Amino acid sequence: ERYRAILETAARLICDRGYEGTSMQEIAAACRMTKAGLYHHIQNKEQLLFAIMNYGMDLFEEQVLSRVQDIANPVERLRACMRHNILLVTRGWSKEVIIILHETRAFIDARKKKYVDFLEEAFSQASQQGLIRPVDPTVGAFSFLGMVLWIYKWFKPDGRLTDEQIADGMVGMLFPPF
Amino acid sequence: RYRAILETAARLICDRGYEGTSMQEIAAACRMTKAGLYHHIQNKEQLLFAIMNYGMDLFEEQVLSRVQDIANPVERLRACMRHNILLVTRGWSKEVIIILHEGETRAFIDARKKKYVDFLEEAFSQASQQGLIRPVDPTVGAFSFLGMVLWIYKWFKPDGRLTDEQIADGMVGMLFPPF
């Protein structure tokens, strides 16, 4: 419990002022610990970032992939996955962890590729079964990911559009009745 | 010569970071004296705003000026998307644009960015009302377009399986098919 709290706090600080502009002393004080206490849990800044990103992938698999991987119809699977990814970004409890994850290298890269593989497989199946307009599966996957992963840069919760309207509109754009 | 400086600086900033990169290092990468650099840019704040303003100039020069006269709004969106993907992927412009999206100066750039979004929203509005695209909230349309296109820098390489043109043909076909 104390460790995940450290990752969440560090992630919030890193998102506010960026990686270079965040010190381990800043992170320690934000966690109500001494710098020595922080280093009991983490080895240095580079490992902290790795830990944040791995925790991010865990959270994503639990809250997005776990829920959709058993949907057999590939366009239903895509539609649910896109809606879950959007709502993760706008409603999630660890938004800054997720931002760092998509914004040791080889270990995280291979984990991220599992999601790209999943999307490409579904676009492939949906295209083949006549449930979506044909498209190259990679073009589909990365259009999907670009639409969802950009949200945090523009979306203002106090603005006109609601996050449910964004989810409905986005899904309807890529995956209309076809 | 000024634009070459900004492109060289954008390269270093993307490779070493903004805090890592110094005006002395920029001068050396430009093969200029510190005095010659200083004539164009005097500190790092000035440099950053200059690069971001150059990026918005590129949206005008490489995208808007090429499409703004297309009367049919779906044809306009299809051309705008293709030009924008090229601006994101061309070696000479790609790092300027990355920096653009990665106090009072913040509002001056924000206002320029919003003129582009406004343009996309007007085209989505016209195309939807005219039945040339499936109905969509114009802001949703605009930022779906923007996310798709700007995120290309995260995964594109010029020796990848898909060319830039294949990516554009495919993206335009997804958002703006015959309808």
Side-chain angles (χ1 to χ4, degrees), chain A residues 3-15 18-19 21-31 33-178, chain B residues 1-15 17-18 20-38 40-44 46-101 103 105 107-121 123-179:
Chain A
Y3 176 83
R4 277 177 309 270
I6 283 169
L7 302 184
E8 297 269 2
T9 301
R12 181 191 62 201
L13 273 66
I14 286 175
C15 277
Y19 181 80
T22 301
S23 83
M24 294 293 271
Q25 291 105 345
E26 286 180 333
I27 296 169
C31 304
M33 322 182 131
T34 78
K35 192 185 204 222
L38 176 58
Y39 279 101
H40 290 182
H41 299 269
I42 305 294
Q43 295 176 7
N44 55 22
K45 203 178 185 188
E46 297 65 37
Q47 186 193 48
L48 172 59
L49 200 74
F50 175 73
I52 290 173
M53 295 177 80
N54 216 72
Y55 172 56
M57 264 316 284
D58 291 343
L59 290 177
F60 176 85
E61 289 167 13
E62 292 150 8
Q63 300 178 32
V64 176
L65 265 188
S66 281
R67 303 187 187 284
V68 304
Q69 63 195 46
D70 300 330
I71 309 172
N73 178 311
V75 77
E76 294 179 3
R77 189 161 71 256
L78 284 166
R79 281 175 189 143
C81 193
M82 184 178 229
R83 188 179 193 85
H84 275 116
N85 214 149
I86 289 167
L87 298 184
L88 181 65
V89 161
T90 60
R91 301 177 182 163
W93 289 17
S94 307
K95 266 178 205 187
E96 299 85 4
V97 171
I98 292 298
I99 285 168
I100 289 166
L101 164 64
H102 60 81
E103 290 288 292
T104 43
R105 149 77 71 166
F107 186 94
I108 304 292
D109 277 15
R111 289 196 71 181
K112 294 193 293 176
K113 176 170 187 295
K114 295 202 173 305
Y115 189 26
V116 176
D117 290 345
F118 175 84
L119 297 171
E120 292 181 330
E121 177 60 14
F123 270 108
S124 191
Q125 294 287 341
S127 181
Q128 271 192 341
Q129 295 172 39
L131 301 169
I132 60 171
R133 187 177 177 88
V135 64
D136 182 290
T138 307
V139 174
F142 285 116
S143 294
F144 173 129
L145 288 168
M147 293 172 49
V148 181
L149 297 183
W150 208 253
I151 288 173
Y152 87 94
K153 283 163 178 254
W154 59 267
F155 169 64
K156 309 293 203 204
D158 75 325
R160 167 178 79 75
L161 211 52
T162 69
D163 53 9
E164 185 159 2
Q165 290 174 318
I166 295 173
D168 285 352
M170 290 201 176
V171 173
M173 277 198 104
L174 285 196
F175 308 116
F178 178 90
Chain B
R1 199 202 185 168
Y2 177 75
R3 289 184 172 193
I5 291 173
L6 302 183
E7 291 167 17
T8 295
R11 282 194 270 284
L12 296 174
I13 285 169
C14 282
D15 174 43
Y18 179 82
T21 299
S22 80
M23 297 300 297
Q24 165 180 300
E25 298 179 321
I26 296 167
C30 290
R31 219 222 312 255
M32 297 172 77
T33 64
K34 298 209 250 206
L37 179 52
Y38 185 91
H40 298 275
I41 304 283
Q42 305 174 350
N43 55 62
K44 284 175 80 179
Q46 294 187 17
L47 176 64
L48 184 55
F49 176 46
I51 293 167
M52 296 183 72
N53 270 328
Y54 180 35
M56 289 319 298
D57 283 347
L58 291 179
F59 272 91
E60 173 67 21
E61 297 179 2
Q62 298 296 311
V63 180
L64 289 175
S65 64
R66 312 282 176 180
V67 303
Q68 66 198 1
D69 304 292
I70 300 169
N72 178 317
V74 81
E75 291 185 11
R76 192 157 78 245
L77 280 161
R78 291 180 184 138
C80 195
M81 184 172 251
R82 184 177 192 83
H83 283 293
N84 202 152
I85 289 165
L86 298 176
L87 170 65
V88 160
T89 51
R90 293 209 191 76
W92 64 268
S93 55
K94 64 195 183 74
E95 291 100 0
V96 172
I97 305 301
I98 291 171
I99 286 162
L100 180 56
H101 285 286
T105 61
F108 180 91
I109 299 294
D110 280 356
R112 296 195 71 185
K113 288 172 176 191
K114 179 177 184 290
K115 288 204 205 85
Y116 190 61
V117 175
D118 289 347
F119 178 86
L120 299 178
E121 292 193 358
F124 271 106
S125 283
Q126 296 172 359
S128 176
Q129 180 63 50
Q130 297 172 31
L132 303 162
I133 58 180
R134 179 174 321 268
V136 71
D137 181 280
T139 305
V140 176
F143 284 108
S144 293
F145 177 126
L146 278 174
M148 281 172 61
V149 175
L150 299 178
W151 213 70
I152 296 177
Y153 89 90
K154 286 298 202 326
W155 59 274
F156 175 83
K157 309 270 178 52
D159 59 357
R161 176 178 71 87
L162 297 174
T163 64
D164 48 0
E165 291 195 317
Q166 285 167 314
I167 296 162
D169 283 344
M171 281 193 190
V172 168
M174 288 203 86
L175 271 209
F176 311 116
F179 173 76

